[PDB]
Amino acid sequence: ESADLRALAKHLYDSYIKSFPLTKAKARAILTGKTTDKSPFVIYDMNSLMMGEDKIKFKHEVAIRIFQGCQFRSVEAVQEITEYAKSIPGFVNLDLNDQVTLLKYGVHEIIYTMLASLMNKDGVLISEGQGFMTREFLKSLRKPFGDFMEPKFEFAVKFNALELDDSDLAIFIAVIILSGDRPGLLNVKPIEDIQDNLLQALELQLKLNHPESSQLFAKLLQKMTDLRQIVTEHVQLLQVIKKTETDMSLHPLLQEIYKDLY
Amino acid sequence: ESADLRALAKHLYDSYIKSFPLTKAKARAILTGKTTDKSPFVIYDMNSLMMGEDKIKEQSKEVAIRIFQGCQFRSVEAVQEITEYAKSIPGFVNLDLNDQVTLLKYGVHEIIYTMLASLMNKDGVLISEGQGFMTREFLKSLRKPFGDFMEPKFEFAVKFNALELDDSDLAIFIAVIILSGDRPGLLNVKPIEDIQDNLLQALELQLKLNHPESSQLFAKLLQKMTDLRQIVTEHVQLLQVIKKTETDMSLHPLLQEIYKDLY
Amino acid sequence: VPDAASKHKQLSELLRGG
Amino acid sequence: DAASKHKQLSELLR
Numbered sequence: 130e131s132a133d134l135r136a137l138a139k140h141l142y143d144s145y146i147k148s149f150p151l152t153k154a155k156a157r158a159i160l161t162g163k164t165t166d167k168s169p170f171v172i173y174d175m176n177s178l179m180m181g182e183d184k185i186k187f188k189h190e191v192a193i194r195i196f197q198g199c200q201f202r203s204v205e206a207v208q209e210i211t212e213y214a215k216s217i218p219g220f221v222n223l224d225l226n227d228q229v230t231l232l233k234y235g236v237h238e239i240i241y242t243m244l245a246s247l248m249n250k251d252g253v254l255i256s257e258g259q260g261f262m263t264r265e266f267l268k269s270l271r272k273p274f275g276d277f278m279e280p281k282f283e284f285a286v287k288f289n290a291l292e293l294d295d296s297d298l299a300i301f302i303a304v305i306i307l308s309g310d311r312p313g314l315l316n317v318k319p320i321e322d323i324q325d326n327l328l329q330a331l332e333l334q335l336k337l338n339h340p341e342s343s344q345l346f347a348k349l350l351q352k353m354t355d356l357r358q359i360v361t362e363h364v365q366l367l368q369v370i371k372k373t374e375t376d377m378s379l380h381p382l383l384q385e386i387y388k389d390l391y
Numbered sequence: 392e393s394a395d396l397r398a399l400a401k402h403l404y405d406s407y408i409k410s411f412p413l414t415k416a417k418a419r420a421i422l423t424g425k426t427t428d429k430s431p432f433v434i435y436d437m438n439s440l441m442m443g444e445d446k447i448k449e450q451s452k453e454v455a456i457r458i459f460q461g462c463q464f465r466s467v468e469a470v471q472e473i474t475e476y477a478k479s480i481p482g483f484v485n486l487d488l489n490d491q492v493t494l495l496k497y498g499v500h501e502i503i504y505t506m507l508a509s510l511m512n513k514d515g516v517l518i519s520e521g522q523g524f525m526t527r528e529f530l531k532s533l534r535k536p537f538g539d540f541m542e543p544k545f546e547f548a549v550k551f552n553a554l555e556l557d558d559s560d561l562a563i564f565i566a567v568i569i570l571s572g573d574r575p576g577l578l579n580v581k582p583i584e585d586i587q588d589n590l591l592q593a594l595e596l597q598l599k600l601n602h603p604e605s606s607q608l609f610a611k612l613l614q615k616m617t618d619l620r621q622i623v624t625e626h627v628q629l630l631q632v633i634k635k636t637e638t639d640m641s642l643h644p645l646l647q648e649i650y651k652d653l654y
Numbered sequence: 655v656p657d658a659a660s661k662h663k664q665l666s667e668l669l670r671g672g
Numbered sequence: 673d674a675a676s677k678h679k680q681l682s683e684l685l686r
């Protein structure tokens with residue numbers, strides 16, 4: 130029974146590696162200068178954004194540029210999370226309405242989870258590890274733009290304190306997607322069956338990979354509610370932007386995800 | 392360590408029993424007719440409400456407003472009971488009083504909704520210590536925006552009650568809830584999290600002994616904490632609609648104190 | 655005809671095939 | 673100063 134749970138873990142880790150180009154292993158390698166990849170460009174003020182901008186591939190106010198660059202990343206992250214979800218056994222056999230609902234509610238929680246992999250207390254990697262934008266600079270963006278990233282840094286510093294690795298994260302984000310309490314699910318039961326198997330694999334995974342971290346499984350499940358508060362607050366700030374800023378349409382896919390979200 | 396975790400479970404269950412007069416055991420006994428208590432009076436429309444105001448529990452108001460005051464009254468008594476319970480959680484009263492206050496402030500409504508689930512079913516909720524049973528449909532039929540308050544609590548309760556927890560599980564679970572290290576504004580996170588890890592170990596042993604053959608019950612219960620947070624958030628937003636549109640929507644000073652600068 | 659799949663055309667498109 | 677901003681909860685506690 131332990132071998133089947135470990136095969137599930139290996140399957141999930143392999144799909145994670147195929148779906149997400151920048152893993153936590155490589156992000157840790159950037160943040161402690163251990164890679165052979167060149168160092169990120171450090172964006173710390175208005176002038177260094179323009180100085181490093183040419184390494185950013187994007188086709189089409191500093192804060193408006195940060196907003197656009199972010200949106201571009203979010204759309205690619207949704208696509209990566211959808212590929213990963215597609216590799217979760219049982220997921221693509223569920224009623225497409227439920228597949229859609231689970232993506233709709235889980236994608237941003239996974240985005241914030243994996244974003245934590247790219248953060249330390251002083252900033253975040255951008256553009257697949259090619260740049261590094263400092264926390265102080267994001268916090269110094271004109272309101273309300275300066276308020277978006279700061280709660281994610283708070284969460285990341287606590288989440289990275291759990292010292293999870295890519296192999297843990299693959300199962301945890303699978304657990305997240307297969308959440309039976311998503312509003313609007315038609316058949317909760319097959320979902321919950323898949324999630325209980327994912328949960329068993331996650332519990333075995335954390336017990337083997339992090340002995341001497343008592344109750345790590347429970348701490349990690351508590352972070353799911355942290356993620357939910359983060360999503361709620363992000364939505365409220367998006368509505369400040371949509372109500373106050375001029376021409377800030379979201380990409381149609383992000384609009385599709387947030388329409389009638391909660 | 393397994394025997395002290397079981398002693399902690401027993402300690403928590405005894406303080407729960409001393410602190411909360413209406414347990415899940417008695418609510419289940421009422422709702423399934425196994426008690427010797429007389430059946431609740433069933434309030435399912437305006438007319439049956441008027442009929443059972445006549446025989447059992449003249450300041451006329453809006454029925455929706457009377458419901459509002461009744462739920463506020465219960466909430467204030469529940470806060471007092473949850474505070475009494477919280478004081479018996481080992482380690483709690485040695486924490487910096489500011490943190491004690493913060494943990495109460497953020498955890499009380501989550502515990503209120505957890506324990507509210509013990510008195511609900513798909514069709515309604517017990518009220519007034521089991522003397523009445525108010526239907527979901529009736530609560531849903533109060534004039535807008537009053538009709539929208541209970542429905543998310545019924546939704547959550549049907550999902551939470553599917554876990555078939557008992558009072559002994561629930562005592563440890565609400566303790567886990569109180570000792571949350573991620574409450575905004577905590578001064579010392581570490582002693583909180585130290586107490587909570589022991590509470591979590593006691594809860595895991597409790598659910599494994601009390602519900603073998605319920606795989607991963609511990610993980611499903613920890614996931615319900617996020618439902619609880621969304622319910623609190625939405626309830627606060629609806630209260631703020633209510634405070635903005637209605638007249639004399641002034642809460643009891645303790646609930647005002649709790650909602651002041653909550654999220 | 656009207657359900658969540660229809661209200662999320664782009665998510666649906668991403669989810670299909672592979 | 674959390675306790676001073678919550679006199680009623682504080683009095684319940686002490």
Ligand SMILES: CN(CCOc1ccc(C[C@H](Nc2ccccc2C(=O)c2ccccc2)C(=O)O)cc1)c1ccccn1
Binds near residue numbers: 196198244253383
């Ligand atoms: C910080 N960062 C890494 C990506 O971080 C993400 C942070 C958040 C997200 C989620 C995503 N958020 C946005 C969506 C559209 C536009 C802006 C944002 C912001 O988040 C934002 C808004 C205003 C100011 C600052 C940020 C979503 O809700 O869909 C996805 C990714 C950057 C920044 C600039 C360029 C590239 N990489």
Ligand SMILES: CN(CCOc1ccc(C[C@H](Nc2ccccc2C(=O)c2ccccc2)C(=O)O)cc1)c1ccccn1
Binds near residue numbers: 466503
């Ligand atoms: C349905 N019910 C039991 C529910 O008891 C609670 C239901 C909710 C709560 C939480 C508590 N709620 C209130 C507090 C003050 C004022 C109103 C409310 C409501 O929540 C409310 C508002 C409008 C309409 C309906 C409810 C809180 O926020 O602190 C605490 C207890 C009762 C109880 C007694 C009398 C009538 N029926």
